[PDB]
Design a protein around this ligand. Sequence first.
Ligand code: SFG
Ligand code: SFG
Lengths: 10, 10, 6, 6, 625, 625
Amino acid sequence: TVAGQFEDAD
Amino acid sequence: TVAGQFEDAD
Amino acid sequence: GRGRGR
Amino acid sequence: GRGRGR
Amino acid sequence: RVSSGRDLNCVPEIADTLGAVAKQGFDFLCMPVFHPRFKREFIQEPAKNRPGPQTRSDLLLSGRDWNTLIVGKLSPWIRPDSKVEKIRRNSEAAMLQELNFGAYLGLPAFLLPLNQEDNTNLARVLTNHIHTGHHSSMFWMRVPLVAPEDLRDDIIENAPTTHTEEYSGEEKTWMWWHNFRTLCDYSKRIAVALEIGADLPSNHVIDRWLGEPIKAAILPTSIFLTNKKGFPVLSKMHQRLIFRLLKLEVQFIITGTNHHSEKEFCSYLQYLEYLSQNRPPPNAYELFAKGYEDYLQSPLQPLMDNLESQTYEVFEKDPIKYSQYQQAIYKCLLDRVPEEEKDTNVQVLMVLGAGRGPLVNASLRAAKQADRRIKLYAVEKNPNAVVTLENWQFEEWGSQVTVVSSDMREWVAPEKADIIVSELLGSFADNELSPECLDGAQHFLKDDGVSIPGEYTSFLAPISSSKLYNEVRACREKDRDPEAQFEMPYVVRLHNFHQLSAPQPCFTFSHPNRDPMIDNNRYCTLEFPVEVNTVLHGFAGYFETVLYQDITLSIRPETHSPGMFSWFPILFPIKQPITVREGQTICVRFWRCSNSKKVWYEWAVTAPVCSAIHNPTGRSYTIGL
Amino acid sequence: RVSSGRDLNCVPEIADTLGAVAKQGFDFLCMPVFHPRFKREFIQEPAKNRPGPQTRSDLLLSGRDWNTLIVGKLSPWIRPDSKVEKIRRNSEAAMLQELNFGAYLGLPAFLLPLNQEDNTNLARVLTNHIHTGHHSSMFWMRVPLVAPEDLRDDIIENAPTTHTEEYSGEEKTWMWWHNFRTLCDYSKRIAVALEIGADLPSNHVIDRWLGEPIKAAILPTSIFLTNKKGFPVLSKMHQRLIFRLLKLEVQFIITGTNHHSEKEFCSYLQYLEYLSQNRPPPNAYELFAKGYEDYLQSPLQPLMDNLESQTYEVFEKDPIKYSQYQQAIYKCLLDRVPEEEKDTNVQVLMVLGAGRGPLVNASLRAAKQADRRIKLYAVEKNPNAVVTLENWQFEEWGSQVTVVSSDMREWVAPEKADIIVSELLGSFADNELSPECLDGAQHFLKDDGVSIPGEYTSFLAPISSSKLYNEVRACREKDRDPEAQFEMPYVVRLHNFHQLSAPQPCFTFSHPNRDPMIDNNRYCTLEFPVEVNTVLHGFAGYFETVLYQDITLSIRPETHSPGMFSWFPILFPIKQPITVREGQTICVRFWRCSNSKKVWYEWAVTAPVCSAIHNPTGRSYTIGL
Ligand SMILES: Nc1ncnc2c1ncn2[C@@H]1O[C@H](C[C@@H](N)CC[C@H](N)C(=O)O)[C@@H](O)[C@H]1O
Ligand SMILES: Nc1ncnc2c1ncn2[C@@H]1O[C@H](C[C@@H](N)CC[C@H](N)C(=O)O)[C@@H](O)[C@H]1O
């Protein structure tokens, strides 16, 4: 749903 | 289709 | 096994 | 059996 | 639903032929893999050096089409049993070639004609093929119901047709099959494609063909009568035979030409569909048994095994058994407690092997409707069933029901029971050691107490079933005596079988047993007249029981309880099939033996031809105490 | 989809818990059958007489729900390996009770822990339960990748941790597993459910684990990292491990509590879906092999028995092989025939074992593209393939092709062949007697002839896998030596396995063998270094062939030809798994014996532990000739 919901943690 | 198409022969 | 069997 | 088997 | 196919001997092209056949509505096409008239030589040159292709390519149809839409037919000129060595050798070579090609195409089934008294060489070739490669294909023997020699017209001046009442001369066709079946050691890959003639034989013959592995039935187009509307129809006896075959679930193959040229060929098929609709819908029992017909299962032994939740769930699906138990309990309560003592008298009722509590619910409902006070115990040895019973007792029953987690044989009751209700009846009456448990429980029954079921008897009936024998023979378990499968009973639905005589009582048990002698070892001898001249394959076992006075519960075919489907007949196999004649009363003997630690059955047939004693000393099958 | 489940040990009510779990998107729930803190005694008088139900009844759920939705867990307080006799006995009784209840409910799987090194008594109890009655509930052993003792923080003053590499100390958990399944005798009903934990071990440890029969993977919610948007995510190493596990079709079990309270618990599962998608989609080979992975099938022997149409059809589905053959033919034709001789010079080409004709079409197309004149002799022994070839030859093929129905070893060619083409290569280099057939055919090859199959070499590589070992053990059949299944090779798509070393060449053949004394018996010795403690289970076998020059067909993993799905690797099992340590060298020996009218392989591992020669005299496996 949210854009970049699954983007890796930095 | 025909009425009584499968009536036994006599 | 439905009935009376395994 | 596919590949080269049986 | 009905699955039917077409039989053709000419196929100029495959694609268009299949298209037309599908348009007509058939499911599969029976065709010759090789041209029927194209004789081939294999020894004598220059004939054997024939150039060019031997048959049409296999690339015309996709592999899926070959595996489902086509059934191969053996060429008509192949006569492996001819009297000439040259012809016999050529026929053998041609049959091997055609069978190998059929295997190459992966045909689902292959049709072989069987229309001679002697076909030993054909059996040899077929069995040699059956042991070479993978050969997943099935084999259907086209065996007429009536030999052509018998149905030929009497139009020869000096070759009159037989008119004597040859009662044994009308079964010859079956013999042809039987012999061939024996030579191929009852191969599971050999079935029958029965061919129906215009004239049908005596009812006993058509019964004979029951129990044989019939896969297809061949209907010539010449057996259909014409109704006044000009359509094809079947005679009443033919219709009954077709209904029976449908109940056997064979595939119908229409063969011949369109005799009723005024109508499309599909009309024939349509008529069959009409009959398929007239088939009465299956009853509750038939629907319940659908899936396990002639499927072998080992009988349950609750005494040493613990049943799963699903087992109890399927047990509880039967309303007839519990309704009749409730009726029996209600009648017993009414008899025992008079109206004047209704308020003051309380009856002690013990439910043995209560399982998940359906018997307890039945007893409570019976007591409520009879308006008699009762105190109930529920004895159960299975700890998980005990857990479920305790949950029930805490939630619903309350203090009225006392749950006991102990074997009734070892339990010491605090009070003497007025009534003991139990269900320990297997397919055979005493298969599940109901007598032993009930005689152990008798010690805490009142002198005037009542035991439900009141009495139970077991019945045996000889049966012939090629399919059942083959499945039993296929139960070979590695790591075991090679012939142990024949020395243990199975519970089967016996859908495809022939019963050679009415069942007769085998063993009888009654409780409570006040006899000073208390023994369960039993010995019985049974005589079964035979009027069919068939081969005996085993013994089917049923049972009946009187719960209380009139209330009865049975699975015997003549008095089968309507709707009840909780039990299937038990099967006692025989090591070797035994042929029987019009006389030759079958004399069989049964033993029920025990050693205080196991219980087992021993059975043997003494007439017409003796046989080995099966399962001696519980060698191959025992029920733990 | 990716089968995902939820692990809970507090389930106040099953109905609402299952509703919530299903709403979140999970597929199954792992729960305790008994209350985790409800200790029970069986040998103490006041305690063993505890009244009331011991657990919630099974009536709460439909029989279907139990069999598919629920997974049982063992109570934490049960310690069968306790040092105290009383505690040990109580734990044994409680574990037996819980396992029996799980069987009664028919749970699909039951989860037991392996949190400590010693598990002998637990293994004994579980094995005793397995060999008692009939049930199908699988068992999942929860084995952390990193032992709990090693994951604790350095908080203790008197018991500090150590930063030593401990290369041998990172495998201890696997040892716990390896011993356990050894105690239970590699039972097929025991599987692993490894727990990922916060930190991963050395990559070699993970590679070793991936060879074990992993059925589930436990993901604590504490390992998920938080991204800038507050959602859970995984580190790169965790993502790679998850990809590898997904390739094995494992079941993911999310366990723990919702640490990211701001979001919903489903956020975890969604992330796995995001990893489920976007993973490298299966290639053509993987899609082709789908459905046949770790499935053992016997190799084909076309020389002895004739193949079916479907086999030839599947052979045709591979375009790469025939494209390579066409390229090799094109190069050979160009080299042999100069441009000035492009006409008036017809090269005699032979195709041996033409099958249904794909090789002949490839040769014709190669000739057309090379613009050279040729003449073919298609040789095929399979009479049905001969029929197909003849039909393909009568049309669409000029007089160039000359179908011959004979064995090349016996056929007497009328003209010497410039080239000979064949595809007798099997999974192993010479599994189908290609050397013998080519040596026989060499007699009619010209002095300067070319054999397009050129050269081929076989490669062996040790492999360890409990899945394949269990499967081959299950391949035991009656009517033969019980150890025969271990003395024959199987064609298998090795999927769940670990390769202990790089392949090394086993045997090499080249044609024509112009040297005298053409013999095919061979003897080879191979040494394989090992870099990790493991349990060798067998030898995987591949082949690599050079067609003509610069054109190669390979199936060895390091140089596998792209899209080449015609051949699967072969497997040579060893009846006794061989434990191997780091630094040891596995020394194995292979014999190819070709006694008259017979051919077979014999293999034996001599180091580090000798094993009996497998398949001596071809007693268990032979190629027939
Ligand atoms: N000797 C025995 N003592 C106590 N319970 C027994 C004994 N033998 C069998 N049982 C139990 O009797 C039960 C058999 C019945 N559940 C069979 C179905 C029956 N309609 C019922 O639900 O009661 C099983 O729970 C067995 O564990
Ligand atoms: N000794 C032999 N003489 C003649 N044909 C043989 C011999 N051994 C094997 N074959 C044939 O070699 C063929 C093997 C090939 N069809 C395998 C697939 C290959 N792509 C092809 O279609 O040619 C089979 O048709 C066998 O019948």
